[PDB]
Paper text:
ARS2 is a direct interaction partner of CBC and together they form a platform for the assembly of co-transcriptional complexes that determine the fate of diverse RNA Pol II transcripts. Our structural analysis shows that ARS2 is made up of two regions, residues 147–270 and 408–763 that co-fold into a structured core with an intervening glutamate-rich region of unknown function that is likely unstructured. The human ARS2 core has an unusual structure comprising a largely helical ‘body’ from which project N- and C-terminal ‘legs’. We find that the RRM domain is required to bind RNA, whereas a basic patch in the C-terminal leg of ARS2 mediates the interaction with FLASH.
Based on the incomplete model, the N-terminal helix was truncated at position 171 with the aim of producing better crystals. ARS2171–270+408–763 crystallised in hexagonal space groups P6522 or P65, diffracting to 3.2 and 3.5 Å resolution, respectively. In mammals, loop A (538-ASEPGT543PPLPTSLPS-552) is highly conserved and proline-rich. In most crystal forms, the loop is disordered presumably due to flexibility. In all crystal structures of hARS2 (except that with loop B deleted), only the first part of the loop is observed with 570-AEEEELL forming helix α10 (‘EEEE helix’). Remarkably, all crystal forms containing loop B, irrespective of space-group, exhibit the same intermolecular crystal contact, in which the acidic ‘EEEE helix’ and the preceding short β-strand pack into the positively charged cradle formed by the RRM β-sheet and the C-terminal extension of the RRM. To accommodate the same intermolecular contact in different crystal-packing environments, some angular flexibility of the loop B structure is required. Concerning loop B, in most ARS2 crystal forms the negatively charged ‘EEEE’ helix binds onto the positively charged RRM β-sheet surface of a neighbouring molecule. Repetition of this inter-molecular contact generates a three-dimensional network.
Residue numbers in the entry:
A (entry chain C): 411 to 537, 553 to 577, 599 to 703, 724 to 762
B (entry chain A): 174 to 269
The structure:
Amino acid sequence: CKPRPLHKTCSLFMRNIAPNISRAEIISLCKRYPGFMRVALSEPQPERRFFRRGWVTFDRSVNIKEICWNLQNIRLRECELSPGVNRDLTRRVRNINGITQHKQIVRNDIKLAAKLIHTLDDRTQLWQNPILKNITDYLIEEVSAEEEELLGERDEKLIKVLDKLLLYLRIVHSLDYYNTCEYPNEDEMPNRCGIIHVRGPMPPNRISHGEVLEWQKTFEEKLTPLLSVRESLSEEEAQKMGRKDPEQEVEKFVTSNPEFVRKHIFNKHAEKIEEVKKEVAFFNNFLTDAKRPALP
Amino acid sequence: DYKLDFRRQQMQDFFLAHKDEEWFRSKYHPDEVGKRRQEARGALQNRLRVFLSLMETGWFDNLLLDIDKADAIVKMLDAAVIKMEGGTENDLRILE
């Protein structure tokens, strides 16, 4: 059997897609070209009135230039797609500061990477994790102090541990560690594993005393946003904005729609009473959230 | 109190204006939030399998995240995507 070029994928890119347009119609539009794989939409942005950036991914054995031309002057629900051929990623393996291959700072990064993996495994609810077994052994210092007391740079053993943690973060949870960012939609987008970040070559001058500690303060400050729990208003603040109670607004639905009429709705029409409760929760989840989408 | 009443209007106007749209439904609507997370964990478990496949196979056995082995990382990242798509050891042979 011939081997397939599954890592390579040519794709389309759409600049402005409307929020009312779902994936369904974009998929079924592009579905009938042979070698179609998957559509990917970005998070909508309030600055452009919540318009999404699309990405229609195709197989390598397909002429994307023809398919990009085919859909060039085609609208979809009062919105011109007008695709452009999304070229492949040139510079994948990017550098960061060369300080990060040091004994003390790698030890710091093993602690933070271990914390991230514990959190992300709980959050996503996988599994326990075999790469997090006896990590505490590598976090502790081990020195010959007594032999100095009586008588008187790279450490690859730590780096090989770190890499298994950092590769897990990147491959599984789509978290590029050194750049300090998530790539949440990667699994739908054309290139599944694109831009990974990597340690620098080496520092030319001496490694300073306080500069190593200053990196660790700055580096941990960038990582803290990535483990941010979703916001919520207080009980009083949420109620003052107008948190609709489920059972109360179910009563408002029944009275608008005497004793024989109430027993008909609860028993026979059991689907409607939950549908109201769902649309109450739909509204309350939007209300409770203290970081809503809104016009700037 | 105006500011309190002002934020009620904006919020309720936005809930009306973006009620039936896919992205908004997906974030807050109970049915669509549940069916999103099943897809997410299903697709995430597929990425976990790939990491565990690359471990025992030894695709990062002698592989440090350093620019000296920049070409080796790209070769591994390709092998990761091939396993995500679901290709066998035969399908990896094009990298050799």
